[PDB]
Amino acid sequence: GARASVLSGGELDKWEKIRLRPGGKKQYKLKHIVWASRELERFAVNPGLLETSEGCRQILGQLQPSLQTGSEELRSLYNTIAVLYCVHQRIDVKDTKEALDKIEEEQNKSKKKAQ
Amino acid sequence: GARASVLSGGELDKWEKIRLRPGGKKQYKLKHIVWASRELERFAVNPGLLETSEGCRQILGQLQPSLQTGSEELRSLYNTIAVLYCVHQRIDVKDTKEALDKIEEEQNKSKKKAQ
Amino acid sequence: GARASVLSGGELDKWEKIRLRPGGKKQYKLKHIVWASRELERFAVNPGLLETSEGCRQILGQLQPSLQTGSEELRSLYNTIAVLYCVHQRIDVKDTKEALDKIEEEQNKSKKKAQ
Amino acid sequence: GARASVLSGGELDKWEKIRLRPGGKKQYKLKHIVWASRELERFAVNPGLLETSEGCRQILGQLQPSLQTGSEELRSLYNTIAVLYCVHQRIDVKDTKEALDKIEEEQNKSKKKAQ
Amino acid sequence: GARASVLSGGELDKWEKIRLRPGGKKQYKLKHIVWASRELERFAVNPGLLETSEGCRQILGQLQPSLQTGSEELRSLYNTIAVLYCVHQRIDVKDTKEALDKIEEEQNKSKKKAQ
Amino acid sequence: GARASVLSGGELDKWEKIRLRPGGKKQYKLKHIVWASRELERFAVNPGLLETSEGCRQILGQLQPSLQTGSEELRSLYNTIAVLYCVHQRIDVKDTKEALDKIEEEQNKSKKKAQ
Numbered sequence: 261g262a263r264a265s266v267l268s269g270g271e272l273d274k275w276e277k278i279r280l281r282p283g284g285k286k287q288y289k290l291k292h293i294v295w296a297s298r299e300l301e302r303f304a305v306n307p308g309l310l311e312t313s314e315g316c317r318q319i320l321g322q323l324q325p326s327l328q329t330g331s332e333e334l335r336s337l338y339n340t341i342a343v344l345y346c347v348h349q350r351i352d353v354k355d356t357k358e359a360l361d362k363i364e365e366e367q368n369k370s371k372k373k374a375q
Numbered sequence: 376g377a378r379a380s381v382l383s384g385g386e387l388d389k390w391e392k393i394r395l396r397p398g399g400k401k402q403y404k405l406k407h408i409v410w411a412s413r414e415l416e417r418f419a420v421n422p423g424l425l426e427t428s429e430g431c432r433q434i435l436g437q438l439q440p441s442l443q444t445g446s447e448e449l450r451s452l453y454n455t456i457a458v459l460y461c462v463h464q465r466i467d468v469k470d471t472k473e474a475l476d477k478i479e480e481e482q483n484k485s486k487k488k489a490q
Numbered sequence: 491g492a493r494a495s496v497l498s499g500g501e502l503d504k505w506e507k508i509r510l511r512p513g514g515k516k517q518y519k520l521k522h523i524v525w526a527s528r529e530l531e532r533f534a535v536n537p538g539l540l541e542t543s544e545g546c547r548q549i550l551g552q553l554q555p556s557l558q559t560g561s562e563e564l565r566s567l568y569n570t571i572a573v574l575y576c577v578h579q580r581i582d583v584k585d586t587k588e589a590l591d592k593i594e595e596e597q598n599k600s601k602k603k604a605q
Numbered sequence: 606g607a608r609a610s611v612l613s614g615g616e617l618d619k620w621e622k623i624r625l626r627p628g629g630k631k632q633y634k635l636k637h638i639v640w641a642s643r644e645l646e647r648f649a650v651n652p653g654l655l656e657t658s659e660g661c662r663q664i665l666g667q668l669q670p671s672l673q674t675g676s677e678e679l680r681s682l683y684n685t686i687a688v689l690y691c692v693h694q695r696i697d698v699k700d701t702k703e704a705l706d707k708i709e710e711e712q713n714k715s716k717k718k719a720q
Numbered sequence: 721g722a723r724a725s726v727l728s729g730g731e732l733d734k735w736e737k738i739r740l741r742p743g744g745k746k747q748y749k750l751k752h753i754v755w756a757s758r759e760l761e762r763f764a765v766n767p768g769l770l771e772t773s774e775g776c777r778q779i780l781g782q783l784q785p786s787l788q789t790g791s792e793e794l795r796s797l798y799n800t801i802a803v804l805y806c807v808h809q810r811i812d813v814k815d816t817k818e819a820l821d822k823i824e825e826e827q828n829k830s831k832k833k834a835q
Numbered sequence: 836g837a838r839a840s841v842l843s844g845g846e847l848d849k850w851e852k853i854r855l856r857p858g859g860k861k862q863y864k865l866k867h868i869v870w871a872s873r874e875l876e877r878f879a880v881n882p883g884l885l886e887t888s889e890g891c892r893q894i895l896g897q898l899q900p901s902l903q904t905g906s907e908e909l910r911s912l913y914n915t916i917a918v919l920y921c922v923h924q925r926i927d928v929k930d931t932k933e934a935l936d937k938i939e940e941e942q943n944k945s946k947k948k949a950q
């Protein structure tokens with residue numbers, strides 16, 4: 261079933277246009293997704309939620325408290341999830357940062373109706 | 376000290392008569408506790424908390440926030456503990472859902488003590 | 491660089507005088523720091539937080555809710571960091587119990603400026 | 606004519622992506638469909654009713670009261686039908702519980718504006 | 721746990737002392753429970769319900785509308801369950817007919833208390 | 836992503852149909868594009884900015900005060916960037932003159948609300 265987002269014009273295709281870091285020639289591979297899937301099993305975070313935007317949304321919210329203190333792999337994973345989230349939401353980034361930006365702002369939009 | 380628990384009418388005797396799932400044929404076994412002991416150690420949690428209702432009430436509180444995100448193994452563990460809790464409280468549960476019902480009833484009760 | 495580890499009146503010179511138990515004849519060692527660094531890495535935490543008081547403060551903040559149900563290793567990990575915190579802050583402690591006393595006294599400072 | 610529904614975007618394609626329970630890797634199978642047909646014949650329910658959401662709806666109305674005391678295979682049959690029902694309405698669940706919540710919403714709400 | 725079936729005054733001690741008919745010399749035998757166990761599996765009814773008076777109470781309600789046009793095997797099952805209910809409730813019924821009288825008296829307690 | 840510019844109905848299709856000059860005998864060749872891209876790496880301009888109209892717009896405004904004293908390769912490149920902008924915006928010119936007009940208009944459209 262995972263192969264349905266793996267299409268050209270889909271999420272994996274877009275993923276490989278998204279840089280790990282904004283000025284690089286290199287984009288995230290499929291293997292970071294696999295790796296991330298496994299790591300989330302290691303954190304007891306269920307991988308199917310990865311095809312579900314709100315489940316990811318909450319995961320990012322659950323994770324934010326741990327990013328300040330967590331490992332570089334956790335930050336790489338957070339950024340991987342953050343990009344996958346914007347990718348599943350069909351919002352367009354050339355790189356990692358823009359997603360972070362979109363998130364915090366989505367969270368600011370959440371803050372505005374958090375009152 | 377394990378030999379204190381193997382008496383007829385004890386916690387293990389009740390344990391082996393409790394259904395894993397509401398409609399489940401099979402019953403809880405000791406290996407679920409052993410597996411759970413190992414898991415809590417993997418989570419840097421005291422496995423000895425599985426022997427008391429104060430301990431179990433606290434573990435269930437610790438694990439509950441991770442259930443939405445969790446794996447079957449974790450849910451099966453949580454459920455195993457809800458049953459252990461009910462057994463330590465001498466509540467004669469016959470399955471997992473009923474044990475779980477009891478836990479959330481106890482939460483409604485603690486709410487009554489904290490209005 | 492190496493001269494720093496044979497420094498007189500330095501942090502390691504103080505560390506080896508601190509007792510494991512209040513009256514005891516056994517003192518803190520370098521291998522406890524090595525173990526704690528490896529464990530934090532195992533727990534998906536940035537080990538770079540051990541070098542300063544503020545990184546350690548974040549770790550102790552992180553560990554405090556987990557103490558209630560924590561393993562003996564997790565409590566040992568907390569206790570080790572608390573003694574190091576005291577060394578970093580230049581608090582003169584002779585044993586583990588005194589380090590815990592000093593830590594609880596430092597935590598009452600934010601209470602003092604609550605009005 | 607069952608094959609008309611095993612095409613991509615159809616019943617089987619979605620069926621194989623729906624979890625048997627909210628938490629696990631085991632997803633629904635075609636052999637379960639061939640079974641569901643046999644089980645409805647066991648209850649004198651015409652399997653051709655599974656091709657219409659209204660057939661299924663009235664059946665679920667028929668069928669739900671027997672689940673409190675009946676088999677785990679019967680609960681599976683109800684849930685299997687609830688998913689086939691959802692396939693026709695194209696309610697997008699990832700799992701069975703979400704279907705059950707959607708079913709008891711479908712068997713409720715209209716209740717308030719039907720009374 | 722075997723010692724429960726040969727307990728003086730236990731449920732099976734009572735079972736074997738309850739007459740199959742009021743004028744008759746025949747008493748309920750364990751094999752009626754066994755025979756009933758195949759029948760409950762055949763009717764897709766959970767066998768664990770006959771270990772408890774509430775599960776039995778609910779089954780007797782479920783069977784109640786269906787008895788007027790039923791089979792001898794089914795009536796023999798209903799009557800077997802009515803005796804098991806009475807035994808589980810610790811009602812010292814001496815025959816099948818008394819177990820039925822007790823079921824209809826118990827059904828009237830909540831009628832007496834209807835308003 | 837240079838290969839995205841290779842779409843039929845896309846940028847290369849249009850480039851090969853766009854005269855290099857208002858009445859130019861030669862039309863765009865992919866080698867000028869490689870070279871152009873490279874040249875922008877020479878000028879500290881990220882090539883990913885040439886895969887978007889926003890990138891090209893920002894580049895032209897920056898470059899613009901320096902256009903009067905720049906090189907013929909840079910002016911050919913400037914008019915190419917102007918065209919890259921126009922093809923990304925799906926604006927149809929057959930030569931570069933119209934693009935100039937559109938750009939001054941974009942500069943004038945941009946300045947029209949600047950009050």
Ligand SMILES: *C(=O)CCCCCCCCCCCCC
Binds near residue numbers: 261262263264265293
């Ligand atoms: C459904 O596609 C079942 C097969 C799952 C394994 C596919 C392996 C290759 C693609 C992995 C994509 C992971 C991210 C969506």
Ligand SMILES: *C(=O)CCCCCCCCCCCCC
Binds near residue numbers: 376377378379381
């Ligand atoms: C505390 O009891 C120490 C550890 C005991 C190990 C398990 C013993 C379980 C009971 C055995 C009873 C054998 C009777 C023949």
Ligand SMILES: *C(=O)CCCCCCCCCCCCC
Binds near residue numbers: 491492493494496
């Ligand atoms: C660091 O303090 C500067 C010197 C780094 C080069 C190696 C020094 C070797 C001598 C160290 C002291 C004696 C051995 C522990």
Ligand SMILES: *C(=O)CCCCCCCCCCCCC
Binds near residue numbers: 606607611639
């Ligand atoms: C339909 O045209 C009637 C003739 C029989 C068609 C069989 C198609 C089998 C498809 C896979 C199994 C479906 C099980 C419900």
Ligand SMILES: *C(=O)CCCCCCCCCCCCC
Binds near residue numbers: 383721722723724
């Ligand atoms: C449950 O109560 C535990 C029962 C343990 C065994 C009791 C002794 C059984 C003796 C059987 C003797 C042979 C009978 C044919």
Ligand SMILES: *C(=O)CCCCCCCCCCCCC
Binds near residue numbers: 836868872
């Ligand atoms: C995006 O396509 C970058 C990765 C592929 C590069 C090789 C194919 C390039 C085809 C067009 C020629 C280059 C023009 C700048």
